[PDB]
Amino acid sequence: SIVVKNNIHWVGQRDWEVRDFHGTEYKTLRGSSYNSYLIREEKNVLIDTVDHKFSREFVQNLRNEIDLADIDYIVINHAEEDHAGALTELMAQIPDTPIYCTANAIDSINGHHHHPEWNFNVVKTGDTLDIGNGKQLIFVETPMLHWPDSMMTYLTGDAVLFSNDAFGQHYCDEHLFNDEVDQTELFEQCQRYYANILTPFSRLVTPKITEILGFNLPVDMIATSHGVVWRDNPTQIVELYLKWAADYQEDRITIFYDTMSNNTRMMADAIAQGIAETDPRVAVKIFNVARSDKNEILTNVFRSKGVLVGTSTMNNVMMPKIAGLVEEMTGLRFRNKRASAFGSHGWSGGAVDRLSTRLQDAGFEMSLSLKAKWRPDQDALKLCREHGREIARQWALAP
Amino acid sequence: SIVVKNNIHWVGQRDWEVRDFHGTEYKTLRGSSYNSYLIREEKNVLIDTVDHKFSREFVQNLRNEIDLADIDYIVINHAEEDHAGALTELMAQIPDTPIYCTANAIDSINGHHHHPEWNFNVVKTGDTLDIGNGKQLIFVETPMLHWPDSMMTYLTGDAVLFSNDAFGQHYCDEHLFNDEVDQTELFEQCQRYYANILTPFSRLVTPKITEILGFNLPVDMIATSHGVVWRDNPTQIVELYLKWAADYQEDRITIFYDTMSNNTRMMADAIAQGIAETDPRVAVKIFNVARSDKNEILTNVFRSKGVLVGTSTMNNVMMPKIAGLVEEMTGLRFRNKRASAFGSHGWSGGAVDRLSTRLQDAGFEMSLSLKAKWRPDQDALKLCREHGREIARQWALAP
Numbered sequence A, B: 001s002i003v004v005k006n007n008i009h010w011v012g013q014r015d016w017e018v019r020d021f022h023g024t025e026y027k028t029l030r031g032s033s034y035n036s037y038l039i040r041e042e043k044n045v046l047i048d049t050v051d052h053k054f055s056r057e058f059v060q061n062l063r064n065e066i067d068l069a070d071i072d073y074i075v076i077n078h079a080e081e082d083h084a085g086a087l088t089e090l091m092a093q094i095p096d097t098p099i100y101c102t103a104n105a106i107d108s109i110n111g112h113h114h115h116p117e118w119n120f121n122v123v124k125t126g127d128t129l130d131i132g133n134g135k136q137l138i139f140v141e142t143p144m145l146h147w148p149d150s151m152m153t154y155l156t157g158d159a160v161l162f163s164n165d166a167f168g169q170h171y172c173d174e175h176l177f178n179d180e181v182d183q184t185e186l187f188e189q190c191q192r193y194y195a196n197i198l199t200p201f202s203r204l205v206t207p208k209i210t211e212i213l214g215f216n217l218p219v220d221m222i223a224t225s226h227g228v229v230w231r232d233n234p235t236q237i238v239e240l241y242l243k244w245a246a247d248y249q250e251d252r253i254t255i256f257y258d259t260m261s262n263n264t265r266m267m268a269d270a271i272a273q274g275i276a277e278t279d280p281r282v283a284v285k286i287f288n289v290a291r292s293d294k295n296e297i298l299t300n301v302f303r304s305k306g307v308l309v310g311t312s313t314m315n316n317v318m319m320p321k322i323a324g325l326v327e328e329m330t331g332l333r334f335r336n337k338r339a340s341a342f343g344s345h346g347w348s349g350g351a352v353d354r355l356s357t358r359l360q361d362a363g364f365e366m367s368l369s370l371k372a373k374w375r376p377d378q379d380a381l382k383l384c385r386e387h388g389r390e391i392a393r394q395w396a397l398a399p
């Protein structure tokens, strides 16, 4: 274990090896960690557990820290298997132990563990739980940040906010605190995380933060369920989330496509050249979706004022990886971003119009499409470049 | 070069390394080859070239076989870059050389090579080209098998049908002839090829074969543009195509899904057990789309009477790889197959209904869907198993 502050002990699990989260939908290229905390005042409280894959280790490590019977209360902020995963193993040892959680968490804990006989205690925002020595826990419901069951737990006196997934990041390090790790890697993992998981819930972020702040409670540390404990200037991550939640965008355009014979690729590269020579302010990134990290593409989309998406026509539909990405983007709800569809075709085409419509339905504000037949020659590449120039001019930010 | 028959010389290219065709849409796990043929009678005819990546080698190898100036005619059956790829390099050396091809091939050759000054000669079905010694070429247009430009070339006397893509397969071997290679690997590659590329054009297969047969011309060999030359019982591949074109299916059910926390996987395995114990005749295969070969999944779908497709709900939509696969299946036009959608959800769900509708639009005849909340317990798994039993009973073939 590691001492977080005073009688708060980190009793979680580092995961250097993990590469796949949510199936393969989120690639954790820097691993992750599952933070669980043991607070030892007059009452002993366990806050969350760890991923199911580490359940035996968790219980064993916990025994080394404290006799399991001495645990008075278990708080479950969020019942996803990367946090409540070890709960069955633990509860097997101390089956009578009270569990504190949201009403929705009873449904999700039961949905994963199927022990409805456990002693659940529903908490609502503002409910408290005394733990002695002048300190108490205060619960704050945070539904759909990012699950219906999600909440946060605030410890008075110590002024620590246990925020579970919120403000966390998948970034494995032996050091627990934000001031102890590489700051660029920390930032990168924070942003990849927000972009790929939290974007669709952005509308909930600012009201919930506003509500928590309105409690006028000190925040000396933010102890999340993934990655570092924010102890040095903890509000830096709070302010980043407020920025990120506000339909965030930089002066950046992302171009991504798939291609069967490189024709749409040629179009993409020409478009980029047109953008680059028209408006040097714009950061441009290009990705072949078949050959790139999907999550990196989406982080870039999150950071972008606009995107261009390419596909050729394949059996009268669009290329499948593009259809898949458009489905996912539809779910992610990118807002206030512009888009333009492009691609090549051999005869009757159709995939570009198909794509443009779906991008519009996903919430992108559509500019004109760009189409070419077979492989662009010199003249066609000029048109692609001019499309880049025209797009750059249309989406230009104020001087 | 290798002698095919008499004065027909194979002057193509083996590709042991290639793993990706059409972007990454077709995985060639046994490599491929690009067959080009040099016929040397009174006239010298080159039939197709090879993939663009081997253009220098092709021209060099061709020079070793014959002085380029002695080539009288060039036949282009199909202008995709894996066959017409070396044409620019070759034509640079013999720019005046006549090219024989379909009207549509002028558009596609120009679309890839941008040399409209080349001497194109449009051929129609039944057109001929004399090459001396009592032999001639007969051209047969085959539009949308698999491109608008596609045709085949028949050589009289020798009785050889140069079928380009049709009847070919991606299977690299140093031996040229079908009787010289492994028969199971040959078959497997033939079927993967038809399933993944030719299924949407199945309606065109039987009429075109009927037309070619109606010419009452002997077929001693079928020299395709990929893989083996069929010299031993060549009609075996013709008969396979007639079987495959007729909305082919075996007593086989394929189950495939994606999953974030293994819940839909548990449903899938239970469904399979229900099928297996109800109707032992049925071959069942299960695939996690995130962890399997996409083309193998589709070959199985091609071979199947019905499928079950699974997804959980992710940000109110379906999982992206499933959306992508459904897009591709929509393009492939599977016919006379049945389907059932299934999956888990956490709260409001929706992805299973979403999937079932898209499967219906793709042409599958839909049976009832199967839904479960969170992780299936014992009771829920019983329901999943019973779904398997019920599906097996509904789709059962006659005794």
Ligand SMILES: Cc1cc2nc3c(=O)[nH]c(=O)nc-3n(C[C@H](O)[C@H](O)[C@H](O)COP(=O)(O)O)c2cc1C
Residues within 6 Å of the ligand: A258, A259, A260, A261, A262, A263, A264, A265, A311, A312, A313, A314, A315, A316, A317, A344, A345, A346, A347, A348, A349, A350, A373, A374, A375, B022
């Ligand atoms: C498997 C396959 C299917 C195709 N289907 C269509 C089609 O339905 N309609 C069309 O106009 N072109 C079709 N084409 C032609 C391509 O759209 C054309 O080659 C285009 O220029 C390729 O662009 P890309 O290199 O970016 O993939 C198809 C090509 C392939 C290889």
Ligand SMILES: Cc1cc2nc3c(=O)[nH]c(=O)nc-3n(C[C@H](O)[C@H](O)[C@H](O)COP(=O)(O)O)c2cc1C
Residues within 6 Å of the ligand: A022, B258, B259, B260, B261, B262, B263, B264, B265, B311, B312, B313, B314, B315, B316, B317, B344, B345, B346, B347, B348, B349, B350, B373, B374, B375
């Ligand atoms: C990233 C993510 C997004 C989710 N979105 C939804 C949703 O929009 N609606 C819903 O009912 N459940 C949603 N869920 C809950 C899952 O559907 C639920 O966990 C389901 O049981 C997972 O099935 P699986 O393990 O086969 O992926 C989501 C879960 C995750 C991890």
Ligand SMILES: [Cl-]
Residues within 6 Å of the ligand: A192, A295, A296, A297, A299, A300
């Ligand atoms: Cl990223």
Ligand SMILES: [Cl-]
Residues within 6 Å of the ligand: A313, A343, A344, A345, A348, A349, A350, A351, A352, A353, A371
């Ligand atoms: Cl188009």
Ligand SMILES: [Cl-]
Residues within 6 Å of the ligand: B192, B295, B296, B297, B299, B300
């Ligand atoms: Cl296969």
Ligand SMILES: [Cl-]
Residues within 6 Å of the ligand: B313, B343, B344, B345, B348, B349, B350, B351, B352, B353, B371
């Ligand atoms: Cl559902």
Ligand SMILES: [Fe+3]
Residues within 6 Å of the ligand: A078, A080, A146, A165
């Ligand atoms: Fe979570």
Ligand SMILES: [Fe+3]
Residues within 6 Å of the ligand: A080, A082, A083, A165, A225, A226
């Ligand atoms: Fe988490």
Ligand SMILES: [Fe+3]
Residues within 6 Å of the ligand: B078, B080, B146, B165
């Ligand atoms: Fe082809």
Ligand SMILES: [Fe+3]
Residues within 6 Å of the ligand: B080, B082, B083, B165, B225, B226
């Ligand atoms: Fe080919």
Ligand SMILES: [O]
Residues within 6 Å of the ligand: A078, A080, A081, A082, A083, A165
């Ligand atoms: O989580």
Ligand SMILES: [O]
Residues within 6 Å of the ligand: B078, B080, B081, B082, B083, B165
């Ligand atoms: O091809």
